[model samples]
Target: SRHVVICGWSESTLECLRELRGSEVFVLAEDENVRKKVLRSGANFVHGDPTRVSDLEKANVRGARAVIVDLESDSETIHCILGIRKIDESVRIIAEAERYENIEQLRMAGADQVISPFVISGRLMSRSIDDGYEAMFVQDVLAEESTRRMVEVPIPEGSKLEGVSVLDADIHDVTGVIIIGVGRGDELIIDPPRDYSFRAGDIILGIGKPEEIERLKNYISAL
Candidate 1:
């Protein structure tokens, strides 16, 4: 049968099982309690140690479409990935990591995808702080859907645009990104009028494709 084999009952596995609603999922776990939990999810279950090839084989990991190693600990996740690859080098391996540093290690160990809750949440917060908008809703007509991102650009001390009023700055000519908002210190001004001159402390909240935004920032810096 076409099935995705999930190893371990890490907390994230519940969400994953929900996401993969229509697909046949087989779960492997060492604990009887976990086996019971997996049973409730309406998935086939195999009792086994994820780090052992023999147990992985019991779950038919070699022929499965994919394997998700959902271990709580990063080291165990990597070890499980290594065991998985040895049995079926071609079967996709998806794993989890608790620490940011372990992602690269997990990938090197043959994990096709390494998702870490810690990494995802940490970067989401960082994006909102530095990128102005959270990863969504920043739309650009010419941009690929994924390329629609916003970033806060501060007026540097030596920038030519520093003392210039928005009206005179010719923003569209200089930077392709539209200035959606301006930040003065900790306060935000949504779509400030062109009459407002930029101060060194003022910030330009711009949104567009990544490459274009970088080009705009570079031009602004050179001025």
Candidate 2:
């Protein structure tokens, strides 16, 4: 029983399914061919319109842990999100919108997350042309486990490490994380030398495994 309920069967949904391989997933679509394709791909398939309450219930929405509404039209997406919320208020809902203007509406309709493919594609294309490294870095951070992780930890105004040299902070011993850089105001210091001092309002960046970095985040924020 625990599974991801995806509304609409499209190419984007197919890609998401591939990325979520090994996870229990169910796809809902009105088209018989789409339903057949989803079932053939080893996912549970339900034949119904996502915007209909009875149809969603037929797919066992109450037992679904998460729902992804990816209808081709924004109207359908919003309606589906509203319908899902009515059936299961606690179920996490993610919706896809073709326009950024639809995000707020989807959010108001109880969608936990909203994505705009057009905006994302435009931003990615621009980033690739203007700052390819930054683009690649973001992609690596999201998709690759070994890539350096960016974390922000606030430095209190009067903490023990406030004026201490970056090397003397004992971050590695205290949190087992490596300082990747620091951000002061609008400036970013990458690969800063050990002599760097911690300052108020400065956000420290550490790199490590997810758990180690999370522990460091908690430790620093408590100061």
Each prediction's RMSD over C-alphas, in Å, is: 14.0, 7.8
lDDT string, candidate 1, 23-90, tens digits: 48988888899978888877778888988889988889988888988785787888889998888898
Compared to the true structure, candidate 1 yields what TM-score? Answer: 0.57
Give the C-alpha lDDT of model 2: 0.81
* Clash numbers, per candidate: 0, 0
lDDT of 2 by residue, 1-223 (tens): 5788899977778878876753488888899888678877888877889989999998788878789999979999999998988898988888888888888999999987777878877888987885688667656664465655656777876555777887787787878788778888657899777787778888887766778787776666544
Best by lDDT: 2
Worst 10 residues of 2 by lDDT: 142-151
Stretches off by above 4 angstroms in model 2 are 19-23, 144-223
Estimate candidate 1's alpha-carbon lDDT, on a 0 to 1 scale.
0.79
What's the lDDT for residue 61 in model 1?
Answer: 90
